[PDB]
Amino acid sequence: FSYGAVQQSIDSRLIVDWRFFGRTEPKEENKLWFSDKITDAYNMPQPTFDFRFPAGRTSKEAEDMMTDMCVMSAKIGGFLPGSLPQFMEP
Amino acid sequence: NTVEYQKNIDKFVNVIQGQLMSVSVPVNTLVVDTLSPTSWQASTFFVRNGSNPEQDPLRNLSGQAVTRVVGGMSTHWTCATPRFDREQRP
Amino acid sequence: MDIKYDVVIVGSGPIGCTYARELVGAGYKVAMFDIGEIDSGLKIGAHKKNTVEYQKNIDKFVNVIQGQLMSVSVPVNTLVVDTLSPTSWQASTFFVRNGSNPEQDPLRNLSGQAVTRVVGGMSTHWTCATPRFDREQRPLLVKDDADADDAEWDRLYTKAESYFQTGTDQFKESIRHNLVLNKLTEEYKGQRDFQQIPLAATRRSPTFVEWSSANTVFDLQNRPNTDAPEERFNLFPAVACERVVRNALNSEIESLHIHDLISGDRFEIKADVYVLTAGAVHNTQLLVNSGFGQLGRPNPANPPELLPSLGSYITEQSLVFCQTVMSTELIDSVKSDMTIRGTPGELTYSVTYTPGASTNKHPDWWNEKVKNHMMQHQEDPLPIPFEDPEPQVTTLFQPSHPWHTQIHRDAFSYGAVQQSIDSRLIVDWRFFGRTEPKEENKLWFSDKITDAYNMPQPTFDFRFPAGRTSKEAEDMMTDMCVMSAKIGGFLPGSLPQFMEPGLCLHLGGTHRMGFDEKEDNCCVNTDSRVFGFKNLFLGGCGNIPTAYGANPTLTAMSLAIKSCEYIKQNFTPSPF
Amino acid sequence: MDIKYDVVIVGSGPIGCTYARELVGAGYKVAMFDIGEIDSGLKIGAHKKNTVEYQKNIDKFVNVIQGQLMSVSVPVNTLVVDTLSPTSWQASTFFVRNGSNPEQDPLRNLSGQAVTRVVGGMSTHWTCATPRFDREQRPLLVKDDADADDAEWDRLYTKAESYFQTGTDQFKESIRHNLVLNKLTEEYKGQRDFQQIPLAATRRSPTFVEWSSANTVFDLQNRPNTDAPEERFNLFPAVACERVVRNALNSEIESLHIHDLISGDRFEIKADVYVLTAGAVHNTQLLVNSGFGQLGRPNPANPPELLPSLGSYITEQSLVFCQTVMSTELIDSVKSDMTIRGTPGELTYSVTYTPGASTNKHPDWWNEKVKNHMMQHQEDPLPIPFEDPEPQVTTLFQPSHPWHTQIHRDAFSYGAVQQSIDSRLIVDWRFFGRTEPKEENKLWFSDKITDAYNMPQPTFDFRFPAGRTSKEAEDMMTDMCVMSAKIGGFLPGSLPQFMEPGLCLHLGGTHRMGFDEKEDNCCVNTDSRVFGFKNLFLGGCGNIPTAYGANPTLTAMSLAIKSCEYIKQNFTPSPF
Ligand SMILES: *Cc1cc2c(cc1C)Nc1c([nH]c(=O)[nH]c1=O)N2C[C@H](O)[C@H](O)[C@H](O)COP(=O)(O)OP(=O)(O)OC[C@H]1O[C@@H](n2cnc3c(N)ncnc32)[C@H](O)[C@@H]1O
Ligand SMILES: *Cc1cc2c(cc1C)Nc1c([nH]c(=O)[nH]c1=O)N2C[C@H](O)[C@H](O)[C@H](O)COP(=O)(O)OP(=O)(O)OC[C@H]1O[C@@H](n2cnc3c(N)ncnc32)[C@H](O)[C@@H]1O
Ligand SMILES: *Cc1cc2c(cc1C)Nc1c([nH]c(=O)[nH]c1=O)N2C[C@H](O)[C@H](O)[C@H](O)COP(=O)(O)OP(=O)(O)OC[C@H]1O[C@@H](n2cnc3c(N)ncnc32)[C@H](O)[C@@H]1O
Ligand SMILES: OC[C@H]1O[C@@H](O)[C@H](O)[C@@H](F)[C@H]1O
Ligand SMILES: OC[C@H]1O[C@@H](O)[C@H](O)[C@@H](F)[C@H]1O
């Protein structure tokens, strides 16, 4: 699962992927709920999210995880252009 | 698990994307102001193309998707299967 | 700074410069104020393209234009950025950020509308295309007499043409220009007439063109000086003009309230005659902030005290655009008359033609230029010389093709300039439609939100009207596609398209002219005098009340010339 | 134009202006020639950013920068465009198009290298960062006596600083500036020191900064004038300088050949002293065009007669860049001292603080500014005032972090200017690494291909050296990652990245300084005089022989002040 148009200029043998995954505190306010009026493609109540990463530990760890990846990956190679370090869509 | 895909591993992203149906797409507010003045043109950002109007786009899991095929998401997953240590475990 | 002048002019654009040339010329003690600054070099308000370096690198001039176009009305942004770090400060709403206008509906805007705040205004970067309007496009200056009206316009346009140094032969000896010109002439024989775009410019050398500017019209130098020892002019740049002060009786302006941007001080400037030439948006802004029209979101329950049509009936032109890559056939035809002797780069290689040969398809000047290029650059696969001037072709507005056309090379490119394709093959196509004036089409100003100059924020409520305007726009696009195909196929990355509304910067009608305030729904009479007011005049494309396709600047200039004829008759210069 | 000068200076950039100020001051009859023109207003060679309009729309200045940055060497273009219409003229090869350099290897380029041809050079657009070099980055001017070397440098830099008006307090009252500075100080407490980036600048108002320029160094007005009746200066813009002419014995410059670009005339200018300050690329070009070094593709089996190190050992810094969006935490800290009751938008809402309370985390001036923003703009969700100046933070190069740092807001952005995140959150990060001088990294000039002004096309052969340079460069990327995280996460669209080689425009070494020509592999001695030549001097970043990360212009200027010292010791002003 690649996230952008795959580049062709750099030999793939050189390329390494880095994915770091953080844990999220379960919080009451983080909801998956369902519309009573809108429906999905199979006529079932349409799913709706109400979400944000909780401030505190979850948020702090996530930034630190980003920094960890930056620091670790430098040991192997510099960033590939077009695949710079980034948080992915929730 | 086809010879063709493990000989063309870059092409598999496409199969993934082919069966990840987004869970809740908020209403689209992209401005398109270069239509021909003869083409039918919206007065509002109305509910188009399966979008969820219940959905606050700033409190979403925009990347959340579902797969409807026998074998579900396991017909395309990466197969990483670590154990949780206590800290992560119920 | 003097306190009292005979005439004060707000803005140093070509149109302000028209009023200065006429009135400083006529002996009036004139002060000119511009919010922007002198930043074009020693020729004040002169064209920024008139440097050796820009004419050697014309691609780079897009950056100068971009750098002084400041969007008029930016809608609140609603792009979702959901990949911020969780530690980062993150919005709960799409709040008013970055000087966005929350009054602006993003689906009824002239998003491409921008303004320029520099001495010279937009004439320090404009394309300089100055055609006349035919009757169809043009406001009446005399009723019930078409011939008299045509004579009045032609007298005004000839003067306007000398001030700008308009001409139709500065590109006569470009191969590319004539390649395009001749082919379109032949393709539409008997059907349409093609020519050079009338350009406000004077060619100085085979590779240098002095583009005209506000500076050409009036040099903006303070007077008295040596060359004009008996005239009186003062330019005050970095001065934001905020208000004209109306008398209680709404019969006369009593002062211009200015803000000095350098010192910070505010002043009341007194003059016998006041002229607003701050552009079609800004004139309207200064009027509204002075009590004319209606401040705030339009409210038909509160009809305004003064100038009810102000900011209504606004016009801007549809613009469609592409670029083409010159056809193989046409490029072959550039060297039709040449006799070639073997292998390029080699010894055998010789290029020659027969001057005067009747069998030639092209003129001598053409063939000498191709011959010379193909002999000094044998590595090059094209017969076009490297510094061949660009095309500048048009078929002007007519009933059967009601849109202005430009087939040329514009310094304002709309994307990243591309370098895979040789620049000698590319020709831009810009067709401009005319827009019917509608009441509902509006430029208004917020009663709450202010701009970077702490003046009321401008807001558009515009749509290209259904009916003839829309149908003519779509028809206009078919015509560009059809005509352009006769020269070459579309350049990828510049495919045929409608440009953002307002991007073409031909906004008119925001303070529009007519004979009679009520019947003609208008703001100024044919002397450009604001109804009701003895000594208030407006200048600029704001005055034009019609549906027009051609570039409006020259027409606005003509109205300004007329306007100064009134002024000269009705006011007396102070003693020196 | 005159025939005989005491001194002639080629280039009117900040370094040429340094020579002009010292020498015009000491009574030398001086001419200065620049290939470029005056476009930046009545103050000649002034900073183009010193208009009220730009400082109110800072996002727009990038365009001015881009418009006057002409790439030095553009490799031939190999993009595949295969969706042309089949009637369109199409290439068979990737032939020399649009001014490209066919000598250039696209994989050993400093593709971001670019030059500017206007009066005042790059100083009409630069960021004005003027740090001093510490010892590790800086050439020696006295050997075996560190204290004498330090003392010489302190004196030179102190003078250079007064020429530029360099200061470190012009952003002392910025909330965002202090937010980041205080935070970084706290985090690294006792490992690294932070301060204001030293800036060539004077603040006029809470909302306007006069950025320094060539013009600040020397006003470029012709003398004698009212203010300098006994001085002699003449600036000849739009004059391309082509060659210095050597005597037979290679011991003197006999004249300078110029090309007046307007008239097209060519002259030989005679002077006592010849000063070359045309930029690190074009100085090299001029010298190479006058028989110095080796024209054409380097060929070691054809060793140069003069200056065998010219265009070798060149240095360009590595540049890494990101922007950050301020952390929720920092934003909440802005208002830590405030007491906020009720809800925003209501008559019951209040925001108050205790003046001069010992436990306030911020000073009164800060809290006053926050209070007023929050009370007067209750719709806005942020505590930072709208016109709060940008950050301007640095921790300077040290042996344990051998790179220069800028944590700031630069007018030269590198993408589309994003609109979705409030600019008040945004901080820029720019870390600059130093490059070892290596012989094999070369700037050279084609013996066949020429530039827009018909001089030999510059060509680069550059890679960042293996070992220390490459390792510091990666350790610098990571440092940027680690440090910036302390302030907020990365802004999507401005992810941490290495920028195009050359983009930072701190090219050095191309005509480098040393004590001894052979043993230090250099082109000029510590008086910046050319080895062998009594009366030819070179000024600029080209002189700098060491690996440095800090912005080099202050250092170049200092070397030029020492150069002037020698000139006043060895040549007499003509009588006035
Ligand atoms: C798509 C994907 C997901 C995984 C990874 C990568 C990619 C791109 N990588 C990955 C996975 N997880 C692992 O732990 N490690 C890896 O390295 N991915 C996630 C994993 O794929 C899922 O966690 C797992 O399948 C979930 O298993 P499940 O609980 O069995 O659910 P599935 O979604 O796989 O299959 C459910 C299934 O039910 C159907 N369906 C849905 N609704 C209905 C209704 N209303 N009626 C009847 N059936 C229903 C589906 O169509 C489907 O087959
Ligand atoms: C930018 C642009 C402009 C045009 C073309 C290309 C591009 C990229 N090309 C073109 C033009 N139109 C033609 O007829 N043909 C062409 O080939 N363009 C437009 C043309 O440039 C304008 O229509 C013309 O200048 C209008 O002149 P004007 O009515 O004098 O208005 P300007 O905007 O040039 O000058 C006004 C002026 O006033 C100032 N100002 C604004 N507000 C104030 C206040 N409040 N106080 C004091 N001064 C104020 C400005 O700073 C300015 O200079
Ligand atoms: C463009 C840029 C440059 C700087 C910064 C920002 C940006 C975007 N930031 C900055 C820089 N350095 C500082 O130390 N710190 C800052 O934060 N920038 C670099 C700085 O701008 C330059 O180092 C400085 O101007 C160089 O001074 P100079 O050595 O005097 O060179 P210039 O290029 O400025 O001026 C040379 C000059 O000569 C001309 N010319 C070139 N060729 C000829 C010939 N053949 N004949 C006659 N004249 C010639 C030019 O036209 C020019 O004016
Ligand atoms: O958008 C570019 C266009 O700008 C208009 O204002 C000009 O009148 C056209 F000639 C063309 O340059
Ligand atoms: O790339 C942008 C940078 O470029 C330089 O030449 C400057 O010295 C920096 F301050 C910074 O503006």
Short mmCIF file of N, CA and C and ligand atoms in Angstrom, two decimals, chain D residues 127 129 319 406 410 412 414 430 432 503-506 551, ligand 5:
data_model
loop_
_atom_site.label_atom_id
_atom_site.label_comp_id
_atom_site.label_asym_id
_atom_site.label_seq_id
_atom_site.Cartn_x
_atom_site.Cartn_y
_atom_site.Cartn_z
N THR D 127 17.48 38.57 2.42
CA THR D 127 16.85 38.40 3.73
C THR D 127 17.53 39.27 4.81
N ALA D 129 20.23 38.77 6.59
CA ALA D 129 20.86 38.09 7.73
C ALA D 129 22.36 38.30 7.68
N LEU D 319 21.12 22.97 2.34
CA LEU D 319 20.00 23.65 2.96
C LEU D 319 18.92 22.64 3.18
N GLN D 406 18.07 29.20 11.00
CA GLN D 406 17.09 30.27 10.95
C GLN D 406 15.74 29.70 11.22
N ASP D 410 10.60 33.73 6.24
CA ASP D 410 11.33 34.21 5.05
C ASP D 410 10.36 34.63 3.97
N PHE D 412 11.08 34.40 0.83
CA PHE D 412 11.29 33.42 -0.21
C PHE D 412 10.72 32.03 0.19
N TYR D 414 8.91 28.35 -0.85
CA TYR D 414 9.28 27.38 -1.87
C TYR D 414 8.14 26.62 -2.53
N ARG D 430 15.21 26.84 8.61
CA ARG D 430 16.23 26.75 7.58
C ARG D 430 17.59 26.57 8.24
N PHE D 432 21.54 25.50 7.52
CA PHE D 432 22.56 25.62 6.48
C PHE D 432 23.80 24.91 6.96
N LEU D 503 20.36 26.64 -4.01
CA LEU D 503 19.13 27.43 -3.95
C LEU D 503 19.34 28.48 -2.93
N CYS D 504 20.15 28.16 -1.94
CA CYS D 504 20.45 29.07 -0.88
C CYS D 504 21.35 30.25 -1.30
N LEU D 505 21.95 30.21 -2.48
CA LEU D 505 22.72 31.34 -3.04
C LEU D 505 23.84 31.83 -2.14
N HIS D 506 24.55 30.89 -1.52
CA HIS D 506 25.72 31.26 -0.71
C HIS D 506 26.97 30.65 -1.34
N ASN D 551 25.37 32.89 6.69
CA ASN D 551 25.18 33.70 5.49
C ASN D 551 26.45 34.58 5.28
O1 LIG E 5 16.83 30.07 0.43
C1 LIG E 5 16.43 31.20 1.25
C2 LIG E 5 17.70 31.65 2.03
O2 LIG E 5 18.61 32.11 1.05
C3 LIG E 5 19.74 32.87 1.46
O3 LIG E 5 20.67 33.22 0.38
C4 LIG E 5 19.73 33.67 2.80
O4 LIG E 5 20.98 33.93 3.35
C5 LIG E 5 18.80 33.10 3.89
F1 LIG E 5 18.70 34.05 4.92
C6 LIG E 5 17.46 32.56 3.27
O5 LIG E 5 16.56 33.56 2.87
#
